[PDB]
């Protein structure tokens, strides 16, 4: 395809790929929180046990 | 621009601005959770220390 009609097809790929990446990052932040809580518990057990 | 062709340009701005705002709010909810956990720990230390 040529430049006016490429910028339509490309924008569709950018939108989808950007959405996919945002989904990934959000999920990682939520999972990170769970791991942090586990690490905090492990650190407490290290101190107290 | 005139009304049929403004509703195309505007919709693009609405989509982007709405996405930006949703991103902000999601990040605030995740950060809020971290602060809450810290506050819960501080409250525990207040009681026990």
From Swiss-Prot, chains A, B:
Subunit of the fusion protein that is processed upon entry into the host cell. Mediates fusion of the virion and cellular membranes by functioning as a class I viral fusion protein. Contains a viral fusion peptide that is unmasked after S2 cleavage. This cleavage can occur at the cell membrane by host TMPRSS2 or during endocytosis by host CSTL. In either case, this triggers an extensive and irreversible conformational change that leads to fusion of the viral envelope with the cellular cytoplasmic membrane, releasing viral genomic RNA into the host cell cytoplasm. This is Spike protein S2'. It comes from Severe acute respiratory syndrome coronavirus 2.
């Amino acid at each position: 395809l040529c430049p006016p009609e490429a910028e339509v097809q490309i924008d569709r790929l950018i939108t989808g790929r950007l959405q996919s990446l945002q989904t990934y990052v959000t999920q990682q932040l939520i999972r990170a929180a769970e791991i942090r809580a586990s690490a905090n518990l492990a650190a407490t057990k290290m101190s107290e046990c």
